[PDB]
Each structure stands twice: as structure tokens, then as C-alpha cells.
Design a protein around this ligand. Structure first.
Ligand SMILES: CC(C)(O)c1ccc(N2CCN(c3nnc(Cc4ccccc4)c4ccccc34)CC2)nc1
Ligand SMILES: [Zn+2]
Length: 457
């Protein structure tokens, strides 16, 4: 035994000395976790890191294999999301290279990497931090771009905005990465096997992880609610029109096979009810436009004509003319196709837009979990530090000289981080990438790869 007791190791570097304990620094194998926990977390990260790596690479290769058709917004946003999670996996898997984990996570003296960039130490820690943090943050800024684009693409039935998507997603995590290095708040950890911001000083996790993720949840959340509201607004008004069109089509059949004015008058009144009900509906072309807009007046005008022609046939039928009323119903079919059919087509929401919403909501859930776990660690780090400090000073309170009848040391870390919370965080973090990679899990991509192999061989 020597000058230092577990979890401190002997060091000649004063920048590594732990508070009042001169000549001792914190052992590189994170003292807050057991060896069994370390080996369990490394297997977890290796599994999740490799699967994210393979699934995102497949989605990247599938996009570039059909790059002529695939490079189209808002679908190509999923390509860039998958690129962030691919680059991210490399940073997480680097620790599995013979001896790289200890090279990334330890100082030259065998203590924990803290407050990096540190003078005279290698750059292995900052590079791994840059890859993991930049990829993690670019991936979530792309999530806000996914929610915004899905919200704004309903206005069709993104030109120019595409460059502002790239400017925002690649320069924002850049500014955040340079800011962390300027304040030097990168810390190493042997259980995650990476270097990251605010592991030790929890205030920096709050400002560089919780605040940016927090803001993407309120902004991304707002555009998801506005988009899902617009979607059910278009879907309901479309189905209303289809139901009114079907009512007009069925009562037109009745007037065609009628042999009395009472059968004609009854079907015309049911047609008049449908026309005035369909007039109340908001056309999909003006789903976000004024109720007195030029497009809105046009839609209503068509039904005013259609009502007039129903009433003109009703005047003849109400008095006694049967033949003169039935012939007018044939003319209603032309007015129907010229003034209504145009609006029953402008509300057909395509499959891309349908699953782009599913992916946005699914991505939101995983980012919300990530936020909650990062919040848990932020909130409880102050108590995990006083527990550790008390444990260190308990262990360092060693008997000096010949043995007196002193009781056996009784030291333990009271409260320590939750490995389960870290496993939930990493599950939702790597789970976003694996879930977003299933964007190309369609029958159409099976054909893209069939076509590619045939051209190669
Ligand atoms: C210096 C000392 C002993 O006081 C100290 C201080 C803090 C500390 N950490 C280690 C890393 N801890 C973790 N934080 N976040 C996460 C989740 C995460 C990391 C990076 C990117 C995204 C999520 C962890 C995942 C696995 C294992 C540990 C994780 C927090 C507590 N460990 C030791
Ligand atoms: Zn339809």
C-alpha cells in the first residue's frame, strides 16, 4: 500500500490532484461504477453502436443507390438524419479498438480525463467528444427541420429554404462544439467509453445538452401539433366532400330511373341538402386561406350555381313537369365535374406525407426520453458528487503507524448514478437512428437494390 487509497491513484501532476489530497488523483476506471457494470455497459454500447452503424449505412447506401430520385425534400431530410447517427456510431465504437478506450478516457498519469482540452495531454478525448456531440446535436436540429418541413409542405395542395436547413443544422452544433472547448468542459468516462460535456459540472449539461434538446422539443412539438391538426382538417373536409359527392351521385341515379315527380322532388331535396352541406366545407386548396379569399368565393360560387340548377328542376317538378325536371339533372353532372371534382383531387394526401408524420412523432418520443434521462443526471449529479467526496475522505482516513484496536473501515458510495437510466438514454439515443433508418423499409427499396445488383453483375 502507499500514499493514496482507492478510488485515488498516485500522481505527480498537480492539475490531477483531488482537492485537499495532494499527490492523488481519481482512478481512470470510473469509481462510481463496478467492473461488472463497466463490462455490461461496453457490451450494450457495442451491440447498439454496431446495429445503428449498420442500419444507418444501409439507409445511406439505399438513398445514394437511387440518388437521382431520392434527393428530394422533405424525404432526403431522413438521409441527413441517418448520416448524423452513422458518424455518431463511429465515435461510440472507437473505444473497442485494442487499447483506445484507455487512450480516450485517461490522462497521461492514469487519472480520469477532466476539464479537457487539457494542456500537454493528447487530442484523443476532444476528437471523440467532437464526433459524438456534433453528430448528436446535428441529428436533433435535423429533427426540427423534419417537423417544420412536414408542417410547411401541407401548403402545396420548400423552394429556397433548403440552404437555410443546411446552414442551421451544420453551423448551430458547430457553435455549440467550439463553445464547449472554449470553456473546456469535456470529461472522460470509462463506462460510456467516450468524452462528453458536463459529466462532472452538471450546469454545462443543462446549458449544452438540456437547453438545446429542450428548445427542439417545444419548437418540433409545436410544428408536429400544427401539422397533425392540418392533416385531420384536410382529411375530414375531403371525406365530407366525397360523402356529399356520393349523395349527389346516388340521387342522380334515382331521378334517372324515376316514373313520377314525387320521386324526382324527393331526390332533388336530398341533393339540395348535400350541396349546401358541401358548401360549408373548407376546400383543401384554401385549407389555410381566408374564409373570404378569392379561392374561397370561387368554391362557394360553384355550389350556388349547382343549388340554382337544383331549384330550377325543383320548380318544374313541384308543379307537375316530370320530363323537363329529369333532363335538368343530367346538366347537374357537368356542373358537378366542372366545379366540385377539382376540389376532391386537391386533398389526396400522399403516402410520403402520411409516414413523414409517423416518423416525426416517433422521433419526438425518443428525444423526449433522452431529455428526461439527461434531466435525471443533471438534477442528481450534486448528490452523486457529495457521496463520492465523503467516500474518498472516508477511505483516505487510514490508520498511521503500528496497529491499535481500530475498527475495520466502513466506507461506501451512498448514492451513485443509475446504469438503467443510462441504458434508457442510450436506447432512445441509438433507437432514434435505428427507427429513422426504417424510412427506406418499403417494397420500393427492394426493387432499387434488385435493379442495382442486376447492373453490377
Ligand atoms: C469525477 C467523478 C468521479 O466525480 C465523476 C463525475 C461524473 C461521472 N459521470 C459519468 C458519466 N455519466 C453518464 N452520463 N450520461 C450518459 C448518457 C449519454 C452520454 C453521452 C451522450 C448522450 C447520452 C451515460 C451513459 C453511460 C454511462 C454513463 C453516462 C454521468 C456521471 N462520473 C464520475
Ligand atoms: Zn378521396
Amino acid at each position: 500500500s502507499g500514499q493514496c487509497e482507492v478510488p485515488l491513484v498516485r500522481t505527480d501532476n498537480p492539475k490531477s490532484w483531488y482537492e485537499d489530497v495532494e499527490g492523488c488523483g481519481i482512478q481512470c476506471q470510473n469509481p462510481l461504477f463496478t467492473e461488472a457494470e463497466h463490462q455490461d455497459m461496453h457490451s450494450y454500447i457495442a451491440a447498439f453502436g454496431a446495429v445503428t452503424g449498420l442500419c444507418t449505412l444501409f439507409t445511406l447506401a439505399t438513398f445514394v443507390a437511387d440518388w437521382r430520385n431520392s434527393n428530394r425534400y422533405p424525404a432526403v431530410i431522413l438521409f441527413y438524419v441517418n448520416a448524423c447517427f452513422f458518424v455518431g456510431s463511429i465515435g461510440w465504437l472507437a473505444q473497442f479498438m485494442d487499447g483506445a478506450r484507455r487512450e480516450i478516457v485517461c490522462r497521461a498519469d492514469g487519472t480520469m480525463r477532466l476539464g479537457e482540452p487539457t494542456s500537454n495531454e493528447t487530442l484523443s478525448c476532444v476528437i471523440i467528444f467532437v464526433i459524438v456531440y456534433y453528430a448528436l446535436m446535428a441529428g436533433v436540429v435535423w429533427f426540427v427541420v423534419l417537423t417544420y418541413a412536414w408542417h410547411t409542405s401541407f401548403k402545396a395542395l420548400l423552394s429556397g429554404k433548403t440552404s437555410y436547413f443546411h446552414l442551421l443544422t451544420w453551423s448551430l452544433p458547430f457553435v455549440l462544439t467550439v463553445a464547449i472547448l472554449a470553456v473546456a468542459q469535456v470529461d472522460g468516462d470509462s463506462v460510456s467509453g467516450i468524452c462528453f460535456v458536463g459529466y462532472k459540472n452538471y450546469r454545462y449539461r443543462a446549458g449544452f445538452v438540456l437547453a438545446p434538446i429542450g428548445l427542439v422539443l417545444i419548437v418540433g412539438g409545436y410544428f408536429l401539433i400544427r401539422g397533425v391538426m392540418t392533416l385531420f382538417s384536410i382529411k375530414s373536409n375531403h371525406a365530407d366532400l366525397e360523402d356529399n359527392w356520393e349523395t349527389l351521385n346516388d340521387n342522380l341515379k334515382v331521378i334517372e330511373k324515376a316514373d313520377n315527380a314525387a320521386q324526382v322532388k324527393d331526390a332533388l331535396t336530398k341533393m339540395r341538402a348535400a350541396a349546401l352541406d358541401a358548401q360549408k366545407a373548407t376546400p383543401p386548396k384554401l385549407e389555410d386561406k381566408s374564409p373570404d379569399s378569392p379561392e374561397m368565393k370561387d368554391f362557394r360560387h360553384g355550389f350556388d350555381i349547382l343549388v340554382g340548377q337544383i331549384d330550377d328542376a325543383l320548380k318544374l317538378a313541384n308543379e307537375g313537369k316530370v320530363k323537363e325536371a329529369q333532363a335538368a339533372a343530367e346538366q347537374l353532372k357537368t356542373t358537378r365535374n366542372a366545379y366540385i371534382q377539382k376540389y376532391l383531387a386537391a386533398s389526396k394526401i400522399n403516402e410520403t406525407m402520411l409516414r413523414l408524420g409517423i416518423f416525426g412523432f416517433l422521433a419526438f418520443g425518443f428525444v423526449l426520453i433522452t431529455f428526461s434521462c439527461h434531466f435525471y443526471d443533471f438534477f442528481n449529479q450534486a448528490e452523486w458528487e457529495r457521496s463520492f467526496r465523503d467516500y474518498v475522505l472516508c477511505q483516505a482516513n487510514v490508520t498511521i503507524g503500528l496497529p491499535t484496536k481500530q475498527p475495520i473501515p466502513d466506507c461506501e458510495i451512498k448514492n451513485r448514478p443509475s446504469l438503467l437510466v443510462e441504458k434508457i438514454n442510450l436506447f432512445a439515443m441509438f433507437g432514434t437512428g435505428i427507427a429513422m433508418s426504417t424510412w427506406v423499409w418499403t417494397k420500393a427499396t427492394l426493387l432499387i437494390w434488385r435493379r442495382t445488383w442486376c447492373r453490377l453483375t
